[PDB]
Design a protein around this ligand. Sequence first.
Ligand SMILES: [Co+2]
Ligand SMILES: [Co+2]
Ligand SMILES: [Co+2]
Ligand SMILES: [Co+2]
Ligand SMILES: [Co+2]
Ligand SMILES: [Co+2]
Ligand SMILES: [Co+2]
Ligand SMILES: [Co+2]
Ligand SMILES: [Co+2]
Ligand SMILES: [Co+2]
Lengths: 313, 313
Amino acid sequence: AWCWASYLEEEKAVAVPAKLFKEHQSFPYNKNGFKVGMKLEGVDPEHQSVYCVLTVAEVCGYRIKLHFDGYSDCYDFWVNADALDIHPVGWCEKTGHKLHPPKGYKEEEFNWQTYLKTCKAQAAPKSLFENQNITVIPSGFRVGMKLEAVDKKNPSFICVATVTDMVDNRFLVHFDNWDESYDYWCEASSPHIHPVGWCKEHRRTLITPPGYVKHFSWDKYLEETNSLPAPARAFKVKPPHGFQKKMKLEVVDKRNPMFIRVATVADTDDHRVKVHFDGWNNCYDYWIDADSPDIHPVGWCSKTGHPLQPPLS
Amino acid sequence: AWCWASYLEEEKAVAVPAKLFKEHQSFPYNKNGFKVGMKLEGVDPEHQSVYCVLTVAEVCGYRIKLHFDGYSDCYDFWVNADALDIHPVGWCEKTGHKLHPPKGYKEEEFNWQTYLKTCKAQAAPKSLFENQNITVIPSGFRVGMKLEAVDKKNPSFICVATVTDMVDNRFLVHFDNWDESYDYWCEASSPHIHPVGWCKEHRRTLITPPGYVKHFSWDKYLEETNSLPAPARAFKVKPPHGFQKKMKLEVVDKRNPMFIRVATVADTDDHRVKVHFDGWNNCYDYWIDADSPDIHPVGWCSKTGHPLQPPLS
Ligand SMILES: [Co+2]
Ligand SMILES: [Co+2]
Ligand SMILES: [Co+2]
Ligand SMILES: [Co+2]
Ligand SMILES: [Co+2]
Ligand SMILES: [Co+2]
Ligand SMILES: [Co+2]
Ligand SMILES: [Co+2]
Ligand SMILES: [Co+2]
Ligand SMILES: [Co+2]
């Protein structure tokens, strides 16, 4: 019978200290009020500019598995009870964002009120959303501003981007003249964004928009698109995460995300940790942002009622 | 007879745009009120924690050559009329900083009033100091806070440092357990400073203080020295400078600093430009911070009454 106490002893090891985990990573303040069958609205994680109709398909401790109504279960995904890119039924209508209805339906005709009755289902209550009354820190970022952004789907490339929306303390990065498939949400301290002129001065090759870098001028482009660059003072410095090699923690199995496993910090860089699942081969290691809501301190699973997968026997 | 107009034409070249130069680099707002013989107080540029008695030895356009009273002329140095690390007679006494008197004198016995009469000289008036009433931007930096700083004298090395003083919007970086010879003044956006934990996560080797990195803990050290780390949010992002290769500008000859020469941006990095003096061999090129008060737009010398050395014949 395995426990963290004796495991730390035998292994002569140490946990990543609790104080290094941020609010969404650490022990939650409250219970998981979500119930299977509850419906809500959510950003499609692979199409981050798109809002979708979602149902809680499963609940596990402080986490929920969400399902795209009327679509295949292969798209299902797990987030914690306090996730940021989920909203209550009605939020899209309230804020004027476009809501993708379930499969078979027309966007115009969809009507939550009738849909909830048909499905004999309740919407998750508004109290559950940790994002209903977020304290808005002042920011230099505004919709329309341009900048230089890593393509998260191809992180080798830095590209011309624009802020196309803002919600609470987050904003949506969109790559000019590309499909919205590559959009992503981040904040002002993101290590994946830089002011215009960054690439040139760091000897990196800026990917310019399709239909247009050996000539490209930011100035000409800003002028022709009647746009402003995000001011440099708007960007913030990402605090060092302080995670060290060999420290222990609990982390979601990216590949079988129903599980959380005992893990070790194998490696570290300026904004990522390389996680190793104890007892597994090293080819199951992987890199994840050190601020990720899917890594947690020792004890998280216990305190929140989620099973911890012990080290592979 | 050489002029910038015809030189730009013949060379088929372009000036660095005026708008890229910062306030201390660009055309000044007022004349140079300094006069030879005027006395003042100044930071010793090679010992930046030390204040010294200085005399204006020469005036050229908007610049002044300053002399350390009673010491060798080899120490003389040039700054612009609006320099930051010069202060009026009496400033050290006003602010409680230690003033190094001229050679031969005792620090305690030195007395500006009697010294000015003996030398039959006037102190530069307080109006001349662009630093007398500087608008103080709010900052997270406070005296005592620790951080990681490049050694500017050996910029290969990042080392453990502390903020040991603050004046207007600048602060003094001091390397723990080293001589003060390595101190230097900077601001919150300096590319030479980073929060604690930076080095470890960027695969750099932090130089720890003498008398103490394969074991070093920032936490233990902060605790034992009863000190706080400068918060990450206090650091700011250095705006890209926008200087491009082949662009023309005017710049001080670092090696014979009485002269300002026609120059070309030869190379660029994240915070520096490599200047080339037109007509000279490439072995006279050198690197300088792109925010340096010694590089200026085409026309600076004309408008301020400083001679421009044309391209070497
Ligand atoms: Co569709
Ligand atoms: Co577009
Ligand atoms: Co797709
Ligand atoms: Co990254
Ligand atoms: Co970094
Ligand atoms: Co002395
Ligand atoms: Co010291
Ligand atoms: Co010395
Ligand atoms: Co440097
Ligand atoms: Co940089």
